[PDB]
Structure formats: structure tokens, C-alpha cells
Paper text:
Most pathogenic Gram-negative bacteria transport haem across the plasma membrane using an ATP-dependent active transport system, the ATP-binding cassette (ABC) transporter system. Here we describe the structures of the type II haem importer system (BhuUV-T) from the Gram-negative pathogen Burkholderia cenocepacia. BhuUV-T is a close orthologue of HmuUV-T910, which is a complex of BhuU (TMD), BhuV (NBD) and BhuT (PBP).
The structure of the BhuUV-T complex revealed that BhuT interacts with the periplasmic surface of BhuU. This binding is mediated by van der Waals contacts, as well as salt bridges between E94 or E231 of BhuT with R84 of BhuU. Most of the space in the cleft of the BhuUV-T complex is occupied by the two H5a helices of the BhuU dimer, and only a very small space is left between BhuT and BhuUV. On the basis of the crystal structure of BhuUV-T determined in this study, the periplasmic gate is tightly sealed by the R204-D200 salt bridges and hydrophobic interaction (L203–L203′) in H5a.
Residue numbers in the entry:
A (entry chain T): 41 to 305
B (entry chain D): 1 to 10, 13 to 55, 59 to 113, 119 to 166, 174 to 263, 267 to 273
C (entry chain B), D (entry chain A): 22 to 133, 141 to 359
E (entry chain C): 1 to 55, 59 to 113, 117 to 167, 174 to 263, 267 to 273
Write the structure that this text describes.
């Protein structure tokens, strides 16, 4: 009985060969695992960053596949202290970080051959994903400037700098991150926004719904008086689809490149 | 006049079938022992208990021909003032700010300016006009609140209610506060009712006396009439003898 | 006859000056270092096509005037609140209005949302809890000073559990966007929000400025104020409403801002006096000054990110708390 | 002749009873599929229930005993603080030790780390700020009661802003970790941890219980306490150390836990008396009983979710502060 | 023998008690007279060694009780030689009358009952608060509270098998009957133990009535000392109190203005 913590790892585990094989059965996950439908059916033991071990053990695991974000350390230690093997994975925002989850989960689940099939499909579609983007820079000009909005604090946006999933996804789609000079997430100033002068606003489906839709995003202070705001240029995508860094990476990048290119027609 | 008739208040009934009246020009002293209604009597004459207090009052107290109950809080302030036993400022007001508050109930200004300063002289606090109240001895503070309450009753028949005003004052100022008050009472047509800790001070300074025993008034009249060993023994539970001077003074037998 | 504080207009004019001054300097910065030539065709008419309108009139000017409105609001409410409790520490958030707005705002963010409904979640939240705290403490009709603080903190516990419960079930977009609002920020300033607020605060200051003399009679004693014929219960009510309004309006869009209601009215009181006729104006002038002065370092000290000005007005209070420590320790 | 210090053993005994009884119910719940027959078989039987032999000794046993230590410690330190300030409101966090622990802990979530070197950050961070607060407030040497709150909440500003900086610059995993860890939780309880915690709180206890007769002569006045030849200034020191040691140890691994310091010693202050010989025991027992009850209600009310128990001990003082008001309204 | 000799004390800016010398004998009752804040509260504070006992105020001269300076006496041991009644406040907690009086046995310790508990009961009775043993002090009147605090200090000096009692205005806010009963006790306590009393009082008449010794303190120095007959004169009172006074006789003398 395997429990997986982290949406992309759940995608990887199911991508090796479904909910249950001769070698394993997935029995639980965290709330961020919304794709595919086999993951969503799984009982959930809370958000990936906050956990109760007795509840985790209530899903009766023999092994836990845990992302780098799985926590808190107190909860993980209680689970490890219960005798369940817990294997933690790294996040490096690049093909290498993804390949280690594919092959590592296959190793942990003892399905090496299935992992070899998944990695080969992924990497070939991945080379195609590099190629489709390289065929044409979105906009037909130099890499455009993209602001990724994670969420809003009232009327103030939280934006991704470097060392973010969004920074990597933006670069992979043939564009350039409008935010420079800081790491991780931080509230956006109108000053940051005007200096960043983004050509496109990228946002998640959840973030777009949370802010109130497309028009609500563009009326945010400072958004109107920017190239993206003057052109009302918004792209929304499912958060798990866009940022998860899992086996859907070539398709996620290809989709992002398309939506950027359509927005800059 | 300020007159209560068969005044009942009450949690027991503390003060029952009280009938008494203070009239302009006359200084009544309220004698009796602690927690026997004196403080409550003054609170009733003040109106603290009849505009919108949970305690029930019966009978009525009439302030110059009209019941208390039918007098606003502002209107009253112009007809009546009270000197609560003591209090400390809690903010560094100067003495002229505090005294000036006495003219608060008179509101549409240099005459309010004027009346402040003349009342500080009269109460013997003029030298303090600029000072900060949180730096004052208990006596300087008392002279200032006396100036402030005096500034409130002027006008150019009012009722001054004294709740043990001389307490914690040195000896010279006790008598000079009570002398001032009788001069104030005489010169204006102003009515004083004063709670006092020392009966001998009530004999010395009150033209009328009320002794509060039981919950009811047990003696009333001039000092010479009320200050007797019998009245004091019943009101105070305490053996008093009587001695003369060149007014009477009381000594325990 | 003298004698008085004659300093008082001098510390009010010089405070009026500096608030204007600081405000101009607040238009003259900062990030996206900017040239105003176009602004004149943008405000009205000038040679150059629309360009600095974009920022200076839509982005910058709303935040400065929001910083003035919030700083005069928390300063002025701080003045009448502490005049009420006779206690210099009474922050205007004792009505439960800072709690109430916080819950209102976090109940919207977690229970789908949209925009321009968040202010009114915070605002309706801020008023409803104030009335709850009142309805407990009062007894129809007189209320009592230590009770209002007791019912105040009991419900503070209630509303605060509802928050700690809400943050727990709240996903990650919820959490980071939560804390930042509870630290307070004018980063999302806009014109028809301070047109939405200003009729509240500017109404609130005027109900307050009119009860200023009854508020002076309190500070020598709630009972002698009664013998002066001030209707203390009504007074408490009028004050407690006016502040729950102005503070309820101002927290709705600014978030949790602290140490202005403690620092602003007290630095004017050691300056001159406790005279409420002159503490209300000055505490607004100073309070406005200081928030606009600390926001202009929320924007600018680390660019391009807004430190929440809560982190900054907290930086203000600590020394001026550590100051009056040193002014008080003789014997 | 005379009198009424009896009734208390009956309320201390029944408190000791109810504390143990509750520990068994706390032992005897987990994720809902576990009966007493196989639990007794696990602890005292064959290796068939050996997986339950892990939990009942490694997961549950340290979680329960932590709740009796956090509960007994916060209640007992609360009794002492409130005897010291002669004010039944003072929580053990007036020294600034709760803030400094919150800071030390959050200054390590953004450092370098891991792992067992975190409850040393919060414990050393909490101790440091408490020695700071004392060193400002102390005169070398007298001290003074209101100057300690002055300097305590002067630094409370400092810390809380260093936090507000950290939570701003902190990425998502760091920001989630903070918020819940400031709400407090015993979901980290394991044996080696509370084997390190216990000899502090049990030590802090024993310095206290030994001061108890000197604290009685404080409650009738600092000047008459001086006349009875209690060295007021030394005792103040010793209380402050022992409560900085216990409360520092305890917040370091349970997070910020409140309202046990305010509710526990005051429910036993109404039951019997304010007599420090009888309040410090009784407050550690009720304090424990309650938090254990409060926790187990967080283990299980929303299983498999583990509610922060700061949500629940807050749901515990809210009715029993509003009770308090119900009985003190007039006046 | 509590003896201050050339006692000088000052808090900036300027002295308050200058070049004083008083001594207080066991068995006699000294009543401190004089204007308010001429230093009597501060005189008393020195005799307890308050301003000496801290392990910022200037004191010179010497104050010695029973042969040893107030400086070198450890405070807990001074609690066994001297007790102080400062007109108190209501407490902060609902201590019962017994608990409070029991705290009077604090400087006598090693729990400490029962002999220390028996003593407490007799102090209340002697101080006239016996019918209050169970009551909660915060429910009491100012007069009932006062007699409990008088019981607590008595319960602190009870010999059974020479000590100094320092009363800071002990009868204020008592009824007439209660003032005199308290001072009569105090004199009886002073006589049957070989105990020494220093008492501030606000009625100069009560000082002639109950004090075997009187010290008049004007200007910050002691300007008259001795028996009531020697001290209670119009001349002494006029300089000490700034007030016209004439003496009156009875079958002790009293004081009348004008």
C-alpha cells in the first residue's frame, strides 16, 4: 500500500501503470493531486504541507513517496517513526528533476521497465517540445516579458521571481520572465509591475477564478497602464497542469507556448 | 429648595422614609457613620439615581419647585454641583484647563475665562495656574477641584453638594475651606449640604445639621440642638460628653 | 490672564506644513524613476501625448491620499478612544473592529470571491463584530469600561479561532495572500476606493470632532463629568460608533495597521497638552505624516517589492516605546 | 477557628483523578479503527498487534505526555506570573519569551535548516528575548512592575516585525510552516524531544513551588512584602528565570499555546482560593486536563485532519471568558 | 530602643527630613503630628529602614533600634523586630480574613502552623474582627478591612512566651467609636508587651488622648517633643500647623480654633 505526496508524483506513479498493478496499489494522496481522475479518487490526508501521522497511517501505508515539499518535518518524522519507508524526491525545475521522479518512483515501486517506457516517451515528446517552441518565438520578436501571478492579496498581486516553477515554465515557452532581481514569491508592487513592463500576464485557472475573472485581473492597480493591460493580454491554465513539473511537462510547455503565441498574434 | 420628601432608595434598602430639605444661604452638615446612607443621600440630591441610573427610588426630591427626575443632566449642572470626595486627573491638564471645565455647562468667551481665575484666588490656588495636575500634593489638588466646582456655580439659587471635601487636607485648610464655603453660601444665595468626617467640624461650620442613624434621619436642627450626648450616642454608637467654649465641642466620656 | 500652551498652533501649522511637504516628496518618488512632462496633457493639456497619467494620477496619487486618510484616521480615532478609556494605551481596535474586518476579509478569501466585495467583506465584518462586542458589554443602557474590554477580548478569541481554523483549511494561494493582508498594505490603492472610504472616515472624523469638549470633561472623571451634565453613555456610544466606522472603513482596504493609534496621539501630548480641542487635529496631522512617511519606505527600501507597511509602522513603534521607557524610571 | 483551606484537597484530588482518567481516554483513541482488546494485546501480548505496539508507545504516548507537560507547565507558570504582578491577567508570555521563541524558530526556517536543531533555535531564541526584556527594564538593581511590560511589549514590536519581514520574504513552504507552527501543535511529539523538554519544566517547577510561601506575602503588597522581609527583587528574578526556562522549553516544540495560562489558574482560583500553596498544584493539574482534552478534540474532531490546538484552546477560553463577564457585569 | 540621631534624608531637588533625632521606647506610644508632607510619612519610612534596607535617596545620621543600626539588620530578621501598618488598599485577590492575618506569621517560618495559627485567631479577637474569619476581604467595608489589617500586624508581633509597631495613620476612615477603640487597644498592646509604637495621626486631639509621647514635626525638623501636656500648646500648634489654637480643659485637654 503506497501513499504519494505531491501532484506530479501521483501523476508519475499512475503514469507507470495505473492505480494497482501486481506490485502495488495506491491508497492515498494529498489534495494537490487533481490529475488524472485516478488520483482524485484517492482518499486525501490534507494538503501536502500539513499532515497528521495517525491519519496518514489510517490509510495503512507500507511506503510513502514524498515530494521535496512534503511536511512538516514533525509529521514526516512521526510517520517514519511508525516504520513506514518514506522516500523523498528533489525539485530542480528542469528535465533532470523530472526524470529522477519518473525513474525514482519506478525504482521505489519496483517497476523499472515501466519507468523506462515512461522516460522514453517523455523525453521524445520533450525533444519535440523544445523543437515546437524553437520553431517560432511567441510574438515573432525577441523573447517576450511575462509576469506570472500566483495569487492576490486583496488588490495586491503575488508574483513569481526566480527559483520558481513559473520562472522555469516561462523560460521553457520561449519567453523571458518580466520579474528579475529576486527569488521565490513576493507581493507585486505597481512599481515592480511598471518597471517589469510585462507583455503578457500568465495566471492559473484557480488564480483567475480567485481574482474574479479576466476583467478583474486587468483592473488590478497598475495592470491597465502596461503593454499586457493596454492589450488586455491574459493567459490562464490549470495550476497543476502548468506548474507541477511532472510527466506532462512536454505537453504543458507546448500548451503554454501555444497560448502565449495566440495571445501575441 | 432642594427637598426630598419620604425619600426611599435601595441589595437592601439603605435609606428609607428620609425627609429633609436644604435651602439657599444655609449650610447643612450630614452626620452619621460609614455606610449608613450619607453618601447615598448626596447621590440622590445630585440626581445620580433618578435620570437613568438598577436601583429604585420612591417619594420625590424637588430642586427649587421641580422634581429632580424632570431635570436634564446639562440643565442640572447649571443648577447644582458636586465635589466628590477626591480624584486624580489621569491626564496632565494644567490647572486652568481643569478649573475652566467648571464653566462647561455654560455654553454660548472671556467671561468663562474670567470666572476661572477669580475662583482660584477665592479657593486659594491662584499660584498654581500654570502647573501640571499630576505634580500636586493632595491639598493643592483639592483646592483646584474646589476652584473648579466654585467656577461652575456663580452666576453673576444654586446648590453645592460636598462629599467629605476637607478629608486628607492639613488642619489649617480644613477650616479655611469650610470658612470659604460659608462665605460662598452667604454671599451668593447658594445652598450647601456637606458630608463631614468630624462632628466637631460640623458643629463649628454648619448652620443646620442632619444626623443619619438607622437608615433614616434621626435628628435635625442647629448645632446647639443636635450635638447632644444622646443624639450622638444613638447615631454613632459611642459615648460622648459635652463641653463649652468662649460653640460646643465633643469629647469621649 | 494667561498662561497657557501657546506652542499649540505652532506645532499644528508646522505639522500641517510637513504633511504637505512629505506628500509632495511622496509624489516625487520612487521605483520606475519617472519624468512628468506628459502629465500636464494627462491631467489636462500639454504638448506630450498621454504617458505619465498612467502612473502619477492612477497609481501614485491614490496611495499617498490613502496613506494620509489612513494615518489621520488611526491617529484621530486613537485620540478619541484614549480620551474615552482615560488610558493612553487604548488602540482603536478594542471595539473588535480590527478582528472583525480580519475575519470578514478571510471569510471571503476562503469561501467563494470577486473583487470590490473583499473591502465590503472586511467592512461589514468590522462593523458586525463591533456591534457584537457592544451588545455583550452593554446592559441597556449604560455599558461600563472594564466590561467592554472583557466582551472585547472574549469575542477576540472567538473571531481568532475562526481565523486559525480558516487558515488551516485554506490552500496555498489562500495562506500567503492571507498573512500579507493581515500585515496591511496600500499597494492596492485606487481612486474609487478612497472615494468609497473617504465619505466614511471624513464622516467619522466629524462626529468625533463635535464631541470634543464632552471628551475633555471626561478626563477628570466619569462621575464629575456626569455632574457637568455630559451624557456619558450617549457620548461613549457616539464615539464608539464613529471609530468603528472610520476604523472599519480604513482597515477594509489598508489591512491591519498598527502603532499609529498609540504613537501619533501620544507624541502630540508630550508636545503640548491633552486638550482634546488640539489633540484631535494634531494626531491626524502627525498620524498622516508618519504613515505616508513609512509607506514611502514600504515601496522603496527594497525594490521592486512592497514590504507590508505593517513591518514598517512596527519599526516606528519599537523605538518610541523604547523611548518613553527611558523617560520613565526615576526612583 | 478557622478555616476554609480544606475543600481544596477535594478539588485537588478530584483534579488528580480527572487528569489520569483523561489520559487513558487520550491513550484510547486514534484513527478510528482500534479497540482496547488489541491495544492491551499490543502493549502486553504477542507480536501479532506489534504494529499497534509501535503507535501506542511511539506516537500516542509521547503526544499525550506532551499535552500533560505543556498543560501543567503553562498553567503553573500562569499561576506564578499572576501572583507576581498581583493581576490575574498576566500570561507567562509577558517576558517576551513566547515572541522570542516564535522568532528564533522562524529565523531558522530561513537559515543556512534541520532538524533537532530547531527546538534549540526556538528555545534559545525565546530565552534571549526574555533576558533582553529584563535587561532593559531592570535598573541594576530594583526593576519595577510596569517598566517590564513597557520593555516587554516594546520588544514585542521588534520581534513581531522581524517576523513580518521573514514571512514576507519566505517562500510558500516556509510561509505555511510558520502560520501553523505559530498556531501550535503536538503532532511532532516523539520520545527524545520531550525527554529533553521535561527536565526543564520539571526544574522550572521545583524552583517555583519552593518560592510559593514568598509569593503569598507578595499578593498583599510589594511594600508590606518588603516589611515581612521577603527579598522582593530576588524573588522577582527567580520567578522570571524559572518561568523563562519552563515556558521557553515548552513553546519550542508545541508552538504558541495560550488561554491555558489565563483560564487554568483562574478556574482553580475561583474554586478555592488565591493561596499559592494550593493554586500552583491545582493549576498544573487543570491546565493539563484541559489541554489534553483540547488536543484530543483536535486529533479526532476532523480526522484525518490534525487541527492546530491553538484553534481549540481558543475555543475554550471564549465561552469561559464570556462566563467570567456574565458574573462580573456589575460593575 | 529605636533611636534616630541627626537623621537627614533627601530626594532631589532638596531635603525633606533634616537633622532629626527621635527615639522610641518600649511600652510608650509616640504620636506624630505636623503639617501634611512635612516628612512624617518619610520619617516612618526610615524607622522601618525602608530607605536603608535595599541591599536612590540620600540619608545621613544614624537610626538604631535596640542597639544595632537599621542598616546591618537583614530584612527578614527586621520583619521579626518591626511591623508596619500602612493604611492599605483592598487586596487584588479574594483572600479570606484568616489567610491575610496568617500572612502576619510570615517572618516566623521554617508551612509553619499550628502555634502560629492559634496566635492569628487571638489577634483578630483582640483587634475585634473575630466574626469575620471566613469572609472574603474584598467584600468588606473600609473599617472591616482596617481591623483585619490591624489583626495581621498584631498577629505578627505576638510574643506569648522589645518590638516596634509603626502605624501610618491607622484610624483614618474609621468611625469615631472605631478610632478610639483601635488606639485603646494599641496602648494596651504597647503596655502588656514591652512594645514600642510610632503612630501618625491626623487629629491632634487624638494625639493628646492616646499618646504618652508626642513629636511635632514642622519645617522638616522636630520642633516640639514630649508629653501631651507639654506639647499641646497654642504656640507649638500655631507654628506646626499655621493655625490659631486655644486649649480647653476637661475633668486631658482638647484643642479648639479661634
Amino acid at each position: 500500500r503506497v501513499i504519494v505526496i505531491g501532484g506530479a508524483l501521483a501523476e508519475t506513479a499512475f503514469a507507470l501503470g495505473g492505480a494497482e498493478t501486481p506490485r502495488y496499489r495506491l491508497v492515498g494522496a494529498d489534495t494537490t493531486c487533481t490529475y488524472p481522475d485516478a488520483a482524485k479518487r484517492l482518499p486525501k490526508v490534507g494538503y501536502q504541507r500539513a499532515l497528521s501521522a495517525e491519519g496518514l497511517l489510517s490509510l495503512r501505508p507500507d511506503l510513502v513517496l514524498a515530494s521535496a515539499e512534503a511536511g512538516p518535518p514533525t509529521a514526516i518524522a512521526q510517520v517514519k517513526g511508525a516504520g513506514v519507508t518514506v522516500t523523498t524526491f528533489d525539485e530542480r525545475h528542469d528535465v533532470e528533476s523530472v526524470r529522477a521522479k519518473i525513474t525514482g518512483v519506478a525504482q521505489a515501486l519496483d517497476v523499472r521497465d515501466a519507468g523506462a517506457a515512461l522516460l522514453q516517451r517523455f523525453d521524445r515528446d520533450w525533444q519535440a517540445a523544445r523543437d515546437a517552441v524553437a520553431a517560432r518565438v511567441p510574438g515573432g520578436a525577441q523573447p517576450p516579458r511575462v509576469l506570472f501571478v500566483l495569487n492576490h492579496t486583496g488588490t495586491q498581486a503575488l508574483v513569481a521571481g526566480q527559483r520558481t516553477a513559473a520562472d522555469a515554465m516561462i523560460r521553457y515557452a520561449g519567453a523571458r520572465n518580466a520579474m528579475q532581481g529576486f527569488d521565490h514569491y513576493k507581493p507585486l508592487t505597481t512599481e515592480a509591475l511598471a518597471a517589469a513592463a510585462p507583455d503578457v500576464v500568465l495566471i492559473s485557472d484557480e488564480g483567475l477564478a480567485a481574482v474574479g475573472g479576466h476583467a478583474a485581473l486587468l483592473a488590478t492597480p497598475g495592470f491597465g497602464a502596461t503593454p499586457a493591460g493596454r492589450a488586455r493580454r491574459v493567459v490562464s491554465l490549470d495550476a497543476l497542469f502548468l506548474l507541477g513539473f511532472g510527466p506532462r511537462l512536454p505537453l504543458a510547455v507546448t500548451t503554454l507556448h501555444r497560448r502565449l503565441s495566440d495571445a501575441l498574434a | 429648595m432642594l427637598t426630598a420628601h419620604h425619600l426611599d432608595v435601595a441589595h437592601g434598602t439603605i435609606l428609607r422614609d428620609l425627609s429633609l430639605s436644604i435651602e439657599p444661604g444655609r449650610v447643612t452638615a450630614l452626620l452619621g457613620r460609614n455606610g449608613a446612607g450619607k453618601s447615598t443621600l448626596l447621590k440622590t440630591f445630585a440626581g445620580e439615581l433618578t435620570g437613568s441610573v438598577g436601583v429604585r427610588v420612591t417619594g420625590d426630591v424637588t430642586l427649587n419647585g421641580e422634581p429632580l427626575a424632570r431635570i436634564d443632566a446639562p440643565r442640572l449642572a447649571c443648577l447644582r454641583a458636586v465635589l466628590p470626595q477626591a480624584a486624580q486627573p489621569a491626564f496632565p491638564f494644567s490647572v486652568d484647563e481643569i478649573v475652566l471645565l467648571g464653566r462647561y455647562p455654560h455654553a454660548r468667551s472671556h467671561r468663562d475665562r474670567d470666572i476661572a481665575w477669580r475662583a482660584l484666588e477665592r479657593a486659594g490656588a491662584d499660584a498654581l495656574v500654570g502647573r501640571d495636575v499630576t505634580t500636586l500634593s493632595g491639598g493643592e489638588l483639592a483646592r483646584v477641584q474646589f476652584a473648579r466646582v466654585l467656577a461652575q456655580l456663580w452666576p453673576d439659587p444654586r446648590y453645592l453638594l460636598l462629599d467629605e471635601p476637607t478629608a486628607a487636607l492639613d488642619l489649617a485648610h480644613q477650616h479655611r475651606l469650610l470658612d470659604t464655603v460659608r462665605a460662598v453660601a452667604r454671599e451668593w444665595q447658594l445652598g450647601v449640604l456637606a458630608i463631614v468626617h468630624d462632628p466637631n467640624l460640623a458643629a463649628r461650620h454648619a448652620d443646620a445639621i442632619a444626623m443619619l442613624a438607622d437608615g433614616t434621619i434621626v435628628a435635625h436642627g442647629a448645632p446647639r440642638d443636635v450635638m447632644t450626648p444622646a443624639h450622638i450616642a444613638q447615631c454613632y454608637g459611642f459615648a460622648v460628653k459635652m463641653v463649652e467654649t468662649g460653640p460646643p465641642v465633643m469629647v469621649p466620656a | 490672564l494667561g498662561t497657557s500652551r501657546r506652542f499649540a498652533p505652532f506645532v499644528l501649522a508646522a505639522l500641517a506644513i510637513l504633511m504637505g511637504a512629505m506628500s509632495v516628496v511622496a509624489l516625487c518618488v520612487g521605483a520606475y524613476r519617472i519624468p512628468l512632462a506628459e502629465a500636464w496633457a494627462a491631467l489636462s493639456g500639454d504638448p506630450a501625448a498621454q504617458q505619465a497619467r498612467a502612473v502619477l494620477l492612477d497609481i501614485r496619487a491614490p496611495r499617498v491620499v490613502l496613506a494620509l486618510l489612513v494615518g489621520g484616521g488611526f491617529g484621530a480615532t486613537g485620540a478619541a478612544m484614549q480620551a474615552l478609556f482615560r488610558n493612553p494605551l487604548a488602540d482603536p481596535g478594542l471595539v473588535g473592529v480590527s478582528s472583525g474586518a480580519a475575519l470578514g476579509a478571510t471569510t471571503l478569501i476562503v469561501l467563494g470571491a470577486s473583487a470590490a466585495a473583499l473591502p465590503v467583506a472586511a467592512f461589514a465584518g468590522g462593523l458586525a463584530v463591533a456591534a457584537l462586542v457592544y451588545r455583550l458589554a452593554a446592559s441597556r443602557g449604560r455599558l461600563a469600561l472594564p466590561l467592554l474590554l472583557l466582551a472585547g477580548i472574549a469575542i477576540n478569541a472567538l473571531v481568532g479561532a475562526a481565523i486559525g481554523l480558516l487558515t488551516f483549511v485554506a490552500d496555498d494561494a489562500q495562506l500567503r495572500s492571507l498573512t500579507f493582508w493581515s500585515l496591511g498594505s496600500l499597494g492596492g490603492a485606487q481612486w474609487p476606493t478612497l472615494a468609497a472610504v473617504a465619505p466614511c472616515v471624513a464622516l467619522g472624523g466629524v462626529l468625533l470632532v463635535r464631541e470634543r469638549d464632552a471628551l475633555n470633561a471626561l478626563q477628570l472623571g466619569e462621575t464629575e463629568a456626569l455632574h457637568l451634565g455630559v451624557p456619558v453613555q450617549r457620548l461613549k456610544r457616539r464615539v464608539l460608533v464613529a471609530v468603528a466606522l472610520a476604523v472599519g472603513a480604513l482597515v477594509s482596504c489598508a489591512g491591519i495597521i498598527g502603532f499609529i493609534g498609540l504613537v501619533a496621539p501620544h507624541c502630540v501630548r508630550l508636545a503640548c497638552g491633552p486638550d482634546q480641542r488640539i489633540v484631535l487635529p494634531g494626531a491626524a496631522l502627525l498620524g498622516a505624516l508618519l504613515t505616508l512617511a513609512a509607506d514611502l519606505a514600504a515601496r522603496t527600501v527594497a525594490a521592486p517589492a512592497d514590504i507590508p507597511l505593517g513591518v514598517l509602522t512596527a519599526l516606528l513603534g519599537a523605538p518610541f516605546f523604547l523611548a518613553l521607557l527611558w523617560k520613565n524610571r526615576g526612583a
